[PDB]
RNA sequence: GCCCGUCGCUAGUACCGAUUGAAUGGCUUAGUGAGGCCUCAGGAUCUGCGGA
RNA sequence: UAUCUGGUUGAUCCUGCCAGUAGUCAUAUGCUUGUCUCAAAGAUUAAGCCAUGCAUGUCUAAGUAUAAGCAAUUUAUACAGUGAAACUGCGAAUGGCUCAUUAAAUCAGUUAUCGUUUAUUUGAUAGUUCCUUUACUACAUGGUAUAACUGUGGUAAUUCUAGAGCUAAUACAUGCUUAAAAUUGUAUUUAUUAGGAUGAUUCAUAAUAACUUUUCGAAUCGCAUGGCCUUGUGCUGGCGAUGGUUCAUUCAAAUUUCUGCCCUAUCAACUUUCGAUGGUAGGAUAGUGGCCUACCAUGGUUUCAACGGGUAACGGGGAAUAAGGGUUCGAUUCCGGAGAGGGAGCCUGAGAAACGGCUACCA
RNA sequence: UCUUAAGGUAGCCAAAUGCCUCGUCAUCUAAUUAGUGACGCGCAUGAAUGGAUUAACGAGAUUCCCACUGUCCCUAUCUAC
RNA sequence: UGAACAGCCUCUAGUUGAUAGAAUAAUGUAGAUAAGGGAAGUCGGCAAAAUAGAUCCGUAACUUCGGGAUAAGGAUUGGCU
């Protein structure tokens, strides 16, 4: 999207009150956190204008469980991407490996600018959508 | 399965109960209590098969009902009360007094104690919170809850609880040197001292435990139970003092004490 | 009963899942409350675990909070004017969460007059000293300034009448009030 | 005929089946929650009836044999204390243990009076239980207050120790 | 010496085959749609302006 | 216990299969049949149909007993012991059986609940129940039923019951004895504020303004009957059982991360009308979630085998046979699923889509 | 073996061409000289005196099926002239 | 109105001409309707009935690949805001 307040509703962090009766500085009160496990919260998640209630840093979604790494293969959806987690399955009888791949839809916060082919690390969270269960926490590309 | 399960079969019973596999279809399913269904010793198996006092379940029930038997400081009458790790079971009519504890093989021992020690028990504080009205409280591994603990008492410590009244007699912290009781895992019943922990994020924490004979092993922090100072236990340990010698060493000891 | 299981939805790969188990109570859904206005009528629905839920219909009044002041008063509901999900709820005057509604202004107006001693639109010594201490508090923004003259306050409903039985809400203010007013006047 | 009772409320001269729930006539449930579809008859009186049960709201000028001429006395008198008080016109303070109905029963030659046990009857047992409840609550109140004060003093001592440690630090 | 195929008899197996062939099961468009449930009402009757 | 042998030829050397050999908690069957221990056993075809009779009922000292029952008030005039019948509370959602349906479904290992419900057990836990703010309260304590019963009956018939008169509660609908310590409980909901622990949180908890058709905060029961005198049926007083809100515990439940399944291209494109992938918002849920709904973008899977089809396919722990590799089987004693002829709906309950529970259709 | 100039080949058929004939078998129906599919020693089928098949088309001929109805069971009534 | 120099009604224009009056018998000619059944009628579904416009969905064998096709089979249809 382009404008912050796009949908038919007003986008704001729940239980965050601007207190419009105070003329303080910085003209905003954004609620963030640190996801833990050493995952650094980006400065875009620090200072940005979006809301994305599903963001692990600003939204009310907590990262816990399996931490995974993949390479994205699709970014056409809205604030959601699909990663191809390649792995080598092992057949015991023939005592050698075979190539296999899995696609796990992973939710992406606007704090990152992801591109097809990058390598992104994600973490398990509560079911975001029917198939989406993870959120991206770091990207890597060059 | 459209509700709670109220039956247990002999094969599905935990192995350390040491029930035989051919006498009866079912096993005594523990009722709800301070401890889990596993890693807990029912009074029926502590009497009928451990102490051999009663020959049948009906006689175990009669013993329980005439109120000779009291776990911790309170009399128990249910046939299959889940007496857990450090629970003290009295049997005041025969003047004995046991504290449950794991032998080095990994089973509930029949270790007997005196009343001067039965007047207390230890518990690994498993959670610390602030309850209602801002009051802090601790909850131990046997579901027992104590309000208003010392602020220095944190999770993974041990709290000494008087059976007369739930109150913190003292506590043992979790740090290098403390003697610990490995309650869980492949080292069920082993006793040693802590040299250092690992403290992984998210994953299960790890501790490196060495014993009197310097046999270093590793165990998850969820399966340890610190019980006293360095070589200074706060409880009396069963025979063997939590040292597991090899199979050949056990055979040699058996043949030498034949 | 309405089933909440995903065993009936098509798989992510378009695979038609097969009927595995008959429907179950621990995944049952219930019909929407569709709470209207006037002549409070709350039906109690038992929920799993022996809990109680207040399926509200025809609610009369609700507790609405002025977040800048911190106070909250019971107030009669004039009616919905904008709903982000569906305009049908606006048309039929349905009370659900995040509904932008008009409510009465007299309780909040009287509270403002008795707490700060000012007026919108248009006596004891302790009262005068209190108003002097609370001076420059009539700096309330032009939106609500004209709102109280209009006699109705725009508030967002923050409760779930189909769940809690109450239609509690909070007064629109500042940026969000301006956004919702712009949506109303977008023509 | 066929023994289907007339249901109070349904307005039709026929026999129709309803889902009879709890607290309704013509159906005695056997299980908690069960509702069985029985067959009843309408409140409309019709030629299809076999017996019609009537109650004499006002007696006529001539009596009947197994009727107003003859009365059958109430089998059991009041059993609760206040029911006995109201039925005998007792006041707030009269004893009720002596007015109780002493029904005479004779096993052959041995006769004895069986009186109902009085429930809701104030008794030293009940008063003792009430006093015990009061004592339990007040004891609990004292215990909680003293424990709260003790932990407050312990926390104050701990914070004083923390201040002493802060003073000791920084040389 | 061996051996091939047509034809003739017997037996078995499968195939094509008019019959808009026939059954059994699964899914499903469309039409009809019981039933319990939620809900708008209806309020017999019973009870102290009310309640069920 | 890392082994072979007979068979194409006049004879030979090979490929090659047929056959022989041995095992099978692998079945049937034929013949024959003394003893001991042990023991499978209507799965295969028909999850086909079922006569009949059983398999879920249950009480103590401790919910209600004036049975017009038994035995006694040798303890008692309200009762006192036992006790049918019945109301009440629990359980009947466990167990047992079968393997039909199921091919990322179940299931196994491994994860999460910072994503929720949880009867019961265990351990803690309601001076604010005068708050509608000191009699709403009768508080030496409150109200009405109604069961059980007698009598009148209907039906060929059912674990059918109507009309009448009785009567209790730990059944229902109410309701105080809480002083008053500070600064007004708890429960619900909304908005605002601070914030010992975790890797991490809007967490735990606390403070405000209120809302609530209002939850809970003991009118229950059995024993022991003791201490204080200003001796009154006064004041205090033990052992318990039952009940109760919140939190924790336990028994669990529901979802959930990764990985893994037989044969099929004579199944290559599939999902996307009207849910498909995702976003916003709301309902719904016990709770997350396209679980459902409205608006919006056009997405999601696939030759690393999708979608479709078959399975004589419940999955696993495991079984038989094997130098090493492996092959075949696993209906079935244990774990987890699913079913009660098919299918759906639902009451009660903490727990059911429950079938030895109902509702309807089909057979 | 007689004989012709050659002796009906490919094909097709009780066909609009088959006397016997309502041929024989199957299907369609309760019942079928009808329809269709087969069998062909075909009185007397058959190759631009064109053979066979053929999508579409047909105010052509024929059979069956669904719907539909006074065609009929079994008739009755109404209006105009 | 409607797709429409279709059908129906009206404007300018033109006619109101066709022997007429009274009754409402049979049989007629033309138009119709019929309960239940639904071709059993008859040589034969002859006559009649049924469907029908538009939008959306769905559409087989066969094929000369162009068609078959409006295949078959279903749903909606007004007014007003």
Q: What is the DSSP string of C96-148?
A: -TT-EEEEE-HHHHHHHHHHH---S----HHHHHHHHHTTT-----HHHHHHH
CB-strand contact D9/E, under 7 Å:
yes
> Under a CB-based contact definition with an 8 Å cutoff, are residues B135 and B148 in contact?
yes
Q: Touching check for A2 and chain C: CB below 8 Å?
A: no
- Considering only residues 6-25 of chain C, list those whose CB is below 7 Å from strand E: 19
Cα D151 from chain centroid (whole Å): 46
> Under a CB-based contact definition with an 8 Å cutoff, are residues C144 and C119 in contact?
no
Six-digit token string for D110: 């041995």
The count of residues in chain B is: 258
Residue B116, phi then psi, degrees to nearest 5? -60, -25
- DSSP annotation of B203 reads S
Query: Distance between CA C102 and CA B101 in Å, rounded?
Result: 68
The answer to whether residue B253 is domain-embedded is no
The answer to whether residue B137 is domain-embedded is yes
Query: Distance between CA B81 and CA B72 in Å, rounded?
Result: 12
The count of residues in chain A is: 142
The answer to whether residue B258 is domain-embedded is no
Domain identity same for B34 and B56: yes
Six-digit token string for C162: 């189909």
Q: How are beta strands B158-162 and C61-66 bridged, if at all?
A: unpaired
Domain identity same for B2 and B96: yes
**Count of C-beta atoms within a 10 Å radius of residue C56:** 25
Domain identity same for B75 and B5: yes
Query: Distance between CA A104 and CA A81 in Å, rounded?
Result: 9
The answer to whether residue B35 is domain-embedded is yes
Query: Distance between CA B3 and CA B6 in Å, rounded?
Result: 9
Q: How are beta strands A134-140 and A96-107 bridged, if at all?
A: parallel
- Using CB atoms within 10 Å of the CB of residue B164, give its burial: 0 to 12 exposed, 13 to 18 middle, 19+ buried: exposed
Helix (H) / strand (E) containing C89: helix C87-92
Domain identity same for B132 and B191: no
Nearest by CB to A130, from C6, C179, C183: name it. C6
* Residue/partner pairs of C65-70 with CB below 8 Å, 24 or more apart: C65/C168, C65/C169, C65/C170, C65/C171, C66/C108, C66/C170, C66/C171, C66/C173, C67/A17, C67/A19, C67/C170, C67/C171, C67/C173, C68/A19, C68/A20, C68/A21, C68/C140, C68/C173, C69/C111, C69/C112, C69/C115
Convert B11-77 into a string of H (helix), E (strand) and C (coil).
CCCCHHHCCCCCCCCECCCCCCCCCCCCCCEEHHHHHHHHHCCCCCHHHHHHHHHCCCCEECCEECC
Six-digit token string for D119: 């429930």
- DSSP annotation of C14 reads S
Domain identity same for B104 and B149: no
> Under a CB-based contact definition with an 8 Å cutoff, are residues D22 and D4 in contact?
no
Six-digit token string for B56: 């049948």
Domain identity same for B186 and B219: yes
CB-strand contact D11/E, under 7 Å:
yes
Q: How many domains does chain B have?
A: 3
For chain A, list the strands marked E by DSSP.
Answer: 67-74, 80-91, 96-107, 119-124, 134-140
Domain identity same for B43 and B111: yes
CB contact under 8 Å between B201 and A64, yes or no, is: no
Query: Distance between CA D8 and CA C18 in Å, rounded?
Result: 49
CA separation, residue B20 to residues B11, B93, B247, C168 (Å): 9, 29, 23, 63
Which residue's entry shows tokens 């809400």?
Answer: C169
Domain identity same for B106 and B132: no
Cα C101 from chain centroid (whole Å): 7
* Domain coverage including residue B129: 121-171
Domain identity same for B97 and B145: no
Query: Distance between CA A35 and CA A16 in Å, rounded?
Result: 19
Q: What is the resolution of this structure in A?
A: 3.1
Tally A–C CB contacts below 8 A. Answer: 28
Q: CA torsion C76→C80→C84→C86, rounded to 10°?
A: 130
Query: Distance between CA C151 and CA A83 in Å, rounded?
Result: 55
Residue D105's SS3 state is strand
Q: Touching check for B201 and chain A: CB below 8 Å?
A: yes
- The experimental method, as deposited, was cryo-EM
Query: Distance between CA D113 and CA D128 in Å, rounded?
Result: 30
Sign of the dihedral through C-alpha A6, A8, A9, A13: negative
Query: Distance between CA A32 and CA B26 in Å, rounded?
Result: 55
Sign of the dihedral through C-alpha C7, C10, C11, C12: negative
| Packing angle of the helix pair C142-150, C106-116 (nearest 10 deg) | 120
> Under a CB-based contact definition with an 8 Å cutoff, are residues A139 and A114 in contact?
yes
Domain identity same for B90 and B179: no
Q: Which nucleotide shows the minimum CA-to-C1' distance to residue D130?
A: F218
The number of CA neighbours under 13 Å toward the Cβ of B39 is: 14
User: CB-based contacts of D103: which residues, under 8 Å, 6+ apart?
Assistant: D113, D114, D115
Domain identity same for B211 and B134: no
Phi/psi class of residue D48: alpha, beta or left (left: φ > 0; alpha: ψ in -120 to 50)?
alpha
Q: How are beta strands B191-197 and B145-147 bridged, if at all?
A: unpaired
Angle at B222 between CA B218 and CA B227, to 5 degrees: 80
DSSP per-residue codes, B168-191: EEEEE--STT-EEEE-SSTTTT-E
CB contact under 8 Å between D155 and B150, yes or no, is: no
Domain identity same for B26 and B75: yes
Six-digit token string for B223: 């399966």
- Using CB atoms within 10 Å of the CB of residue C142, give its burial: 0 to 12 exposed, 13 to 18 middle, 19+ buried: exposed
For chain D, list the strands marked E by DSSP.
Answer: 15-20, 36-41, 103-107, 110-114
């Amino acid at each position: 999207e382009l404008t912050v307040q796009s949908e038919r509703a007003f986008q704001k962090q729940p239980h965050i009150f601007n207190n419009p009766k105070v003329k303080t500085s910085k003209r905003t009160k954004r609620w963030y956190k640190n996801a833990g496990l050493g995952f650094k919260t980006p400065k875009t998640a620090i200072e940005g204008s979006y809301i994305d209630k599903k963001c692990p840093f600003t939204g009310l979604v907590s990262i816990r469980g399996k931490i995974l790494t993949g390479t994205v293969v699709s970014t056409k959806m809205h604030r959601t991407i699909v990663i191809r987690r390649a792995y080598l399955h092992y057949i015991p009888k023939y005592n050698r490996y075979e190539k296999r791949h899995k696609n796990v839809p992973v939710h992406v916060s606007p704090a990152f600018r992801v591109q097809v082919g990058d390598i992104v690390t994600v973490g398990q969270c509560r079911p975001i959508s029917k198939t989406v269960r993870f959120n991206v926490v770091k990207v890597s590309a060059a | 399965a459209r509700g709670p399960k109220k039956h247990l079969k002999r094969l599905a019973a935990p192995h350390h109960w040491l029930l035989d596999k051919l006498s009866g279809c079912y096993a005594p399913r523990p009722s709800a209590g301070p401890h889990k269904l596993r890693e807990s010793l029912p009074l029926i198996v502590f009497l009928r098969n451990r102490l051999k006092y009663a020959l049948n379940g009906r006689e175990v029930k009669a013993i329980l009902m005439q109120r000779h038997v009291k776990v911790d400081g309170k009399v128990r009458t249910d046939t299959t009360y889940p007496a857990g790790f450090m629970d003290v079971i009295t049997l005041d009519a025969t003047n004995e007094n046991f504290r449950l504890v794991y032998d080095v093989k990994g089973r509930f021992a029949v270790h007997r104690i005196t009343d001067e020690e039965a007047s207390y028990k230890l518990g690994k504080v498993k959670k610390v919170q602030l309850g209602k009205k801002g009051v802090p409280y601790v909850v131990t591994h046997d579901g027992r809850t104590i309000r208003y603990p010392d602020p220095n008492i944190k999770v993974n410590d041990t709290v000494k609880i008087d059976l007369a009244s739930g109150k913190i007699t003292d506590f043992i912290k979790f740090d290098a040197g403390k003697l610990v009781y490995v309650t869980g895992g492949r080292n069920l019943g082993r006793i040693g001292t802590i040299v250092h922990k690992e403290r992984h994020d998210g994953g299960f924490d790890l501790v490196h435990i060495k014993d009197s004979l310097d046999n270093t092993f590793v165990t998850r922090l969820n399966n340890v139970f610190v019980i006293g100072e360095q070589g200074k236990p706060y409880i009396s340990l069963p025979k063997g003092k939590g040292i597991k010698l090899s199979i050949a060493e056990e055979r040699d000891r058996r043949r030498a004490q034949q | 009963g309405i089933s909440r299981d995903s065993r009936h939805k098509r798989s992510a790969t378009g695979a038609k899942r097969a009927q595995f188990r008959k429907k179950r109570k621990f995944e049952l859904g219930r019909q929407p409350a569709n709470t209207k206005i006037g002549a409070k009528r709350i039906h109690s629905v038992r929920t799993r675990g022996g809990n109680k839920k207040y399926r509200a219909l025809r609610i009369e009044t609700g507790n609405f909070s002025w977040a800048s002041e911190g106070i909250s008063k019971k107030t009669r509901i004039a009616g919905v004017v904008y709903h982000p999900s569906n305009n049908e709820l606006v048309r039929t005057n349905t009370l659900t969460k995040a509904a932008i509604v008009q409510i009465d202004a007299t309780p909040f107006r009287q509270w403002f007059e008795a707490h700060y001693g000012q007026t919108l639109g248009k006596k004891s010594k302790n009262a005068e000293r209190k108003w002097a201490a609370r001076a420059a508090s009539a700096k309330i923004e032009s939106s609500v300034e004209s709102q109280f003259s209009a006699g109705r306050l725009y508030a967002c409903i923050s409760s779930r009448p189909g769940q809690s039985g109450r239609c509690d809400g909070y007064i629109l203010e500042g940026e969000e009030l301006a956004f919702y007013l712009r949506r109303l006047t977008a023509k | 005929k066929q023994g289907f009772p007339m249901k109070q409320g349904v307005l039709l001269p026929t026999r129709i089946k309803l889902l009879l729930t709890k607290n309704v006539s013509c159906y005695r449930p056997r299980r908690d929650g069960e509702r069985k579809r029985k067959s009843v008859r309408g409140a409309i009186v019709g030629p299809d009836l076999a017996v019609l049960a009537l109650v004499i709201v006002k007696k006529g000028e001539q009596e009947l044999e197994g009727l107003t001429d003859t009365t059958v006395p109430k089998r059991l008198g009041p059993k609760r204390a206040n029911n006995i008080r109201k039925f005998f016109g007792l006041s707030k303070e009269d004893d009720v243990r002596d007015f109780v109905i002493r029904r005479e029963v004779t096993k052959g030659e041995k006769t004895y009076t069986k009186a109902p046990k009085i429930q809701r009857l104030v008794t030293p047992q009940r008063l003792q239980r009430k006093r015990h409840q009061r004592a339990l609550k007040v004891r609990n109140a004292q215990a909680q207050r003293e424990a709260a004060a003790e932990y407050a003093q312990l926390l104050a001592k701990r914070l004083s120790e923390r201040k002493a440690e802060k003073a000791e630090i920084r040389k």
